[PDB]
Write a protein that binds this ligand. Structure first.
Ligand code: GH8
Ligand code: GH8
Lengths: 190, 190
C-alpha cells in the first residue's frame, strides 16, 4: 500500500504538479481512504520526499557500484560512464526530478536531502581529481574541490533543463557528450 | 514614488522573502497608501518582475558596452572581464537575484524574462566561440551553441549558489577564477 501510494504519486506527477494533486487523488489511486493514506504519510509533500529519496539513493548506490568496478577504457569513457549514472537515473524519473527540484524552494527536508548528496558527489569528484593529479594524469590548476563543485552544479542545472525541455537547454540526446567534454577539458587542460 | 516602491522592495528583500512582505509593508516604506501603491503596480509580484528586469537589462547593457569596447589583454582576461559583468551585476543585487530565481517557479512572466535573456547571452557566446574557431584560435569540438548553453547554465547555477551561500557552493571570492578556468579549458581544449 505504501508502494501503491508512491507509484500513484509518481504516475500523477507525469501529468501535473504536486500543488494540483490532492491527498484524495493519491488515496483514490492506491485503492485506500484519505485517513488510511495519513497512516502511511503525513502529507503529499512527505510522499515526494520519499520518492526523491529513492531516486537520489538509486543514483548514489549506482555510483558506489561504478567506483568499486572500474570500467576498462580510456579516461574520456570512464568519465562518460560516471556522468551517465546521473543522466540515466534522474532521466528515468523526470517527474520526481522536476517536482523534487521545485520542492527545494519550499521544503527544508528536500533542500537538506539534496544538499547532503551533492556534498557527497562533489567530495568523491574532488578525491578522484586529486588522485588523477597525484598519479600525474591531470595538472594542478584549480583547487580540486572548487572545480568539482562547479562541474557538479553545471551537471545538476544542465541535466534538469534538458529533462524539462527548458528554453534554453541542451537537447537530451546531446547533453551527455556536452558535459563529458567540459569535465575532461576542465580537469585535464593546462 | 515608483522608484521609492522599487527601493523599499529591494531593501525589504535583503531581510526576508516576498511571501513574508505585504503590499502594506511596501506602501508604508514608500510613504504612500495601499490604494496609491496599486496605481503604480498590480501586485508585489509585479514589483519583483520590474526589479529583476532592471538587473537583467543592466547586465545586458554592460555586456553590449564590453562587446563594442574590446579589452586589450590575453584571451583568459578577455573572458574573465565578460563573466565579471554577471558576477558584479547580479552580485550587487543578491536579494533581487535570489527572489527573481525563486519567482521563476511561480511566475510565467519572470520565467519568460529569464528565458529571453539566457537565449540572448547563449547566442552571443555561441557566435563568439564560432568567430574564435573561424580565426583558428579554438578547435572545432562540441557544437558551439550546445557548449555555450552548458557554460551559461553552469554560470547561472554556480554564481547564484555562491551569492546565496548555499551548501554546496564555490566561495564567492573563488567563483570568478573557477568559471573562467572551465570556459577557457572547454572552449580552447582539444
Ligand atoms: C578516469 C578515472 C580517474 N575516473 C573515472 C570516473 C570515476 C572513477 C575514476 C568513476 C565515476 O563514475 C565518477 C563519477 C563522478 C561523478 C559524475 C557525475 C556527477 C554529477 O553529475 N553530479 C551532479 C548531479 C547530481 C544529481 C543530478 C544531476 C547532476 C558527480 C560525480 C565523479 C568521478 C568519478 O570517478
Ligand atoms: C577572447 C574573445 C574571443 N572574447 C572575449 C570575451 C568577449 C569578446 C570576445 C566579450 C565578453 O565579455 C563575453 C562575455 C560572454 C558571456 C559571459 C558570461 C555569460 C554568463 O555567465 N551567462 C550566464 C548567466 C546569466 C545571468 C546570471 C548568471 C549567469 C554569458 C556570456 C561571452 C562572450 C564574450 O565575448
Amino acid at each position: 500500500r505504501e508502494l501503491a501510494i508512491l507509484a500513484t504519486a509518481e504516475n500523477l506527477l507525469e501529468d501535473r504538479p504536486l500543488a494540483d494533486i490532492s491527498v484524495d487523488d493519491l488515496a483514490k489511486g492506491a485503492g485506500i481512504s484519505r485517513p488510511t493514506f495519513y497512516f502511511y504519510f503525513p502529507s503529499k509533500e512527505a510522499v515526494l520526499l520519499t520518492l526523491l529519496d529513492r531516486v537520489v539513493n538509486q543514483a548514489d548506490m549506482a555510483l558506489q557500484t561504478l567506483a568499486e568496478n572500474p570500467a576498462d577504457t580510456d579516461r574520456e569513457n570512464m568519465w562518460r560512464t560516471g556522468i551517465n549514472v546521473f543522466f540515466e537515473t534522474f532521466g528515468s524519473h523526470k517527474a520526481v526530478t522536476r517536482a523534487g527540484q521545485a520542492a527545494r524552494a519550499t521544503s527544508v527536508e528536500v533542500a537538506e536531502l539534496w544538499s547532503t548528496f551533492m556534498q557527497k558527489w562533489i567530495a568523491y569528484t574532488a578525491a578522484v581529481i586529486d588522485a588523477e593529479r597525484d598519479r600525474g594524469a591531470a595538472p594542478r590548476t584549480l583547487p580540486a574541490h572548487e572545480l568539482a563543485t562547479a562541474l557538479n552544479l553545471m551537471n545538476e542545472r544542465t541535466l534538469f533543463a534538458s529533462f524539462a525541455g527548458e528554453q534554453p537547454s541542451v537537447p537530451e540526446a546531446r547533453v551527455l557528450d556536452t558535459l563529458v567534454h567540459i569535465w575532461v577539458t576542465s580537469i585535464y587542460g593546462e
